Design an enzyme around this catalytic site. Structure first.
Site, PDB file in Angstrom:
ATOM      1  N   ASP A 273      39.921  -8.420  11.190  1.00  0.00           N
ATOM      2  CA  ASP A 273      40.704  -7.406  10.856  1.00  0.00           C
ATOM      3  C   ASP A 273      39.301  -6.825  10.745  1.00  0.00           C
ATOM      4  O   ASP A 273      39.772  -5.755   9.561  1.00  0.00           O
ATOM      5  CB  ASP A 273      41.853  -7.228  10.486  1.00  0.00           C
ATOM      6  CG  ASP A 273      42.490  -6.026  10.454  1.00  0.00           C
ATOM      7  OD1 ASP A 273      42.076  -5.601  11.708  1.00  0.00           O
ATOM      8  OD2 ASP A 273      42.805  -6.143   9.715  1.00  0.00           O
TER       9      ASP A 273
ATOM     10  N   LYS B  50      36.474  -3.802   9.776  1.00  0.00           N
ATOM     11  CA  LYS B  50      36.795  -2.199   9.683  1.00  0.00           C
ATOM     12  C   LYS B  50      36.436  -1.885   8.143  1.00  0.00           C
ATOM     13  O   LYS B  50      36.874  -2.029   6.925  1.00  0.00           O
ATOM     14  CB  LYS B  50      38.035  -1.461  10.494  1.00  0.00           C
ATOM     15  CG  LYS B  50      39.384  -2.298   9.745  1.00  0.00           C
ATOM     16  CD  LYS B  50      41.018  -2.123  10.500  1.00  0.00           C
ATOM     17  CE  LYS B  50      42.013  -1.531   9.429  1.00  0.00           C
ATOM     18  NZ  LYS B  50      43.362  -1.782  10.705  1.00  0.00           N
TER      19      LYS B  50
ATOM     20  N   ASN C 158      39.076  -2.228   5.457  1.00  0.00           N
ATOM     21  CA  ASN C 158      39.593  -3.324   4.609  1.00  0.00           C
ATOM     22  C   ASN C 158      38.537  -3.955   3.913  1.00  0.00           C
ATOM     23  O   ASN C 158      38.943  -5.096   3.520  1.00  0.00           O
ATOM     24  CB  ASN C 158      39.629  -3.956   5.877  1.00  0.00           C
ATOM     25  CG  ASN C 158      41.228  -4.122   6.694  1.00  0.00           C
ATOM     26  OD1 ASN C 158      42.296  -3.436   5.528  1.00  0.00           O
ATOM     27  ND2 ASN C 158      41.809  -5.285   7.559  1.00  0.00           N
TER      28      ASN C 158
ATOM     29  N   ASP D 270      43.734  -7.852   3.362  1.00  0.00           N
ATOM     30  CA  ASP D 270      44.442  -7.500   4.774  1.00  0.00           C
ATOM     31  C   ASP D 270      43.319  -8.563   5.177  1.00  0.00           C
ATOM     32  O   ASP D 270      42.839  -9.131   6.003  1.00  0.00           O
ATOM     33  CB  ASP D 270      43.818  -6.163   5.403  1.00  0.00           C
ATOM     34  CG  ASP D 270      44.985  -6.295   6.437  1.00  0.00           C
ATOM     35  OD1 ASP D 270      45.887  -7.697   6.399  1.00  0.00           O
ATOM     36  OD2 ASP D 270      45.792  -5.640   7.045  1.00  0.00           O
TER      37      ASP D 270
ATOM     38  N   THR E 222      41.962  -3.672  15.915  1.00  0.00           N
ATOM     39  CA  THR E 222      41.217  -2.383  15.871  1.00  0.00           C
ATOM     40  C   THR E 222      41.310  -1.884  16.804  1.00  0.00           C
ATOM     41  O   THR E 222      39.463  -2.409  17.804  1.00  0.00           O
ATOM     42  CB  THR E 222      41.360  -1.122  14.399  1.00  0.00           C
ATOM     43  OG1 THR E 222      41.480  -0.320  15.133  1.00  0.00           O
ATOM     44  CG2 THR E 222      40.086  -1.654  14.255  1.00  0.00           C
TER      45      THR E 222
HETATM   46  N1  LIG Z   1      47.061  -2.598   6.013  1.00  0.00           N
HETATM   47  C1  LIG Z   1      48.192  -2.753   5.531  1.00  0.00           C
HETATM   48  C2  LIG Z   1      49.322  -2.502   5.054  1.00  0.00           C
HETATM   49  O1  LIG Z   1      50.113  -3.561   4.493  1.00  0.00           O
HETATM   50  C3  LIG Z   1      49.759  -1.351   3.898  1.00  0.00           C
HETATM   51  O2  LIG Z   1      48.250  -1.002   3.519  1.00  0.00           O
HETATM   52  C4  LIG Z   1      47.496  -2.749   4.057  1.00  0.00           C
HETATM   53  C5  LIG Z   1      46.007  -3.042   3.231  1.00  0.00           C
HETATM   54  N2  LIG Z   1      45.660  -2.410   1.726  1.00  0.00           N
HETATM   55  C6  LIG Z   1      45.613  -3.109   1.040  1.00  0.00           C
HETATM   56  O3  LIG Z   1      45.762  -4.147   1.196  1.00  0.00           O
HETATM   57  N3  LIG Z   1      44.925  -2.525  -0.025  1.00  0.00           N
HETATM   58  C7  LIG Z   1      44.554  -2.912  -1.446  1.00  0.00           C
HETATM   59  C8  LIG Z   1      44.266  -2.309  -2.299  1.00  0.00           C
HETATM   60  C9  LIG Z   1      43.811  -2.737  -3.286  1.00  0.00           C
HETATM   61  C10 LIG Z   1      43.809  -3.948  -4.211  1.00  0.00           C
HETATM   62  C11 LIG Z   1      44.052  -5.031  -2.863  1.00  0.00           C
HETATM   63  C12 LIG Z   1      44.653  -4.489  -1.636  1.00  0.00           C
END
Ligand SMILES: N[C@@H]1[C@@H](O)CO[C@@H]1CNC(=O)Nc1ccccc1
Ligand SMILES: N[C@@H]1[C@@H](O)CO[C@@H]1CNC(=O)Nc1ccccc1
EC number: 2.7.11.11
Length: 340
Positions: free
Chosen positions: A156, A158, A161, A174, A191
């Protein structure tokens, strides 16, 4: 490869396998946290900033709705994500601190990274200079060397992430498509702009897809847009399989040469997948100035330090509609998620 690197990776695999064989489970619960803000959303999950009520520490809590995971055929993928995250340990990976489940949802509570996604910073600045792109790329090379040595494919990569921490280093988040694979695997996932040709063509594929994706990421960081850009996925896929790429004239010759070798359509000729493995990438001229040990030790001063006020500041993330975390009175999908 120097014996110090071989011994490091041997120990890393021993430590990973011990946690892989005996995963942690059920290490917190929802009412130990206050919900602050939604940081991202998807078709079956969200990520929210939370604060632990007793310690005051902030975390990012990923919440997956079990019924939606089942409907979207993501059961095995969500079990992979948690089992891998609770077993890995590397400077440029987000750290899983707790996990648990309830009647409705699965929860992965990660350290919070306040600098936001690389995607936002890239789009705000336009493009990164080659030294800046190379600083990030080096961390991804070391992280893939670590993951691949554990037989893990990430799948994944990109800019969304890649989170930027308080020191300006990357944390990869992710692991929803990450999988332990000795040999080949077959699932269509990832993606569109980042998919390797062999995924598009429905082949059995291997860890070489992560090195293709690294070529897409380096191109996008240095140009400001991805190499196979088009308006709809079918058109993106036709460009990916074609074997052609146009480089901006501002790219260095060394950058173009590295990218031709990462964006090689024939997986058996792609850098990262030859006899010398990751060392054909680490020794390439574009990385001649990179001090790999200093990057791993976080001793290099970063090109960019995100602006934020403290560990609860969410200004580097954007605004989403705030929805409740509902938990049914009845257990849903208990059998499917027994191991979580
Ligand atoms: N696309 C995925 C969906 O579940 C919604 O956002 C997910 C991806 N975003 C993150 O993992 N953010 C994050 C931010 C800070 C610390 C740790 C993690
Ligand atoms: N630009 C930084 C900003 O926080 C104020 O001064 C800092 C100086 N350090 C670097 O730029 N380091 C670096 C390291 C690797 C690649 C590219 C750049």
């Amino acid at each position: 490869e120097q014996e110090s690197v071989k011994e490091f990776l041997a120990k890393a695999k021993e430590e990973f396998l011990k946690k892989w064989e005996s995963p942690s489970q059920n290490t917190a619960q929802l009412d130990h946290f206050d919900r602050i803000k939604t940081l991202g959303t998807g078709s079956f999950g969200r990520v929210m900033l939370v604060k632990h009520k007793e310690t005051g520490n902030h975390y990012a809590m990923k919440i997956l709705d079990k019924q939606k995971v089942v409907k979207l055929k993501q059961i095995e993928h969500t079990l992979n994500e948690k089992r891998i995250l609770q077993a890995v340990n590397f400077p440029f990976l987000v750290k899983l601190e707790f996990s648990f489940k309830d009647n409705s949802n699965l929860y992965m509570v990660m350290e919070y990274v306040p600098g936001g996604e690389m995607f936002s910073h890239l789009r705000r600045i336009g493009r990164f200079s080659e030294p800046h792109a190379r600083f990030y790329a080096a961390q991804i090379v070391l992280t893939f060397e670590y993951l691949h040595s554990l037989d893990l494919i990430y799948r994944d990569l990109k800019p969304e992430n890649l989170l930027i921490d308080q020191q300006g280093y990357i944390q990869v988040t992710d692991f929803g498509f990450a999988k332990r694979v000795k040999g080949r695997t077959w699932t269509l996932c990832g993606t569109p702009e980042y998919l390797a040709p062999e995924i598009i063509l429905s082949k059995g594929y291997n860890k070489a897809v992560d090195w293709w994706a690294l070529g897409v990421l380096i191109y996008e960081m240095a140009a400001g847009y991805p190499p196979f850009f088009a308006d709809q996925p079918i058109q993106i896929y036709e460009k990916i399989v074609s074997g052609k790429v146009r480089f901006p004239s501002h790219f260095s010759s060394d950058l173009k040469d590295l990218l031709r070798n990462l964006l090689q359509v024939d997986l058996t000729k792609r850098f990262g997948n030859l006899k010398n493995g990751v060392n054909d990438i680490k020794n390439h001229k574009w990385f001649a100035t990179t001090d790999w040990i200093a990057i791993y030790q976080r001793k290099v001063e970063a090109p960019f330090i995100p602006k934020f006020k403290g560990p609860g500041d969410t200004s580097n993330f954007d605004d989403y509609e705030e929805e409740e975390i509902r938990v049914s009175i009845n257990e849903k999908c208990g059998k499917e998620f027994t191991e979580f």
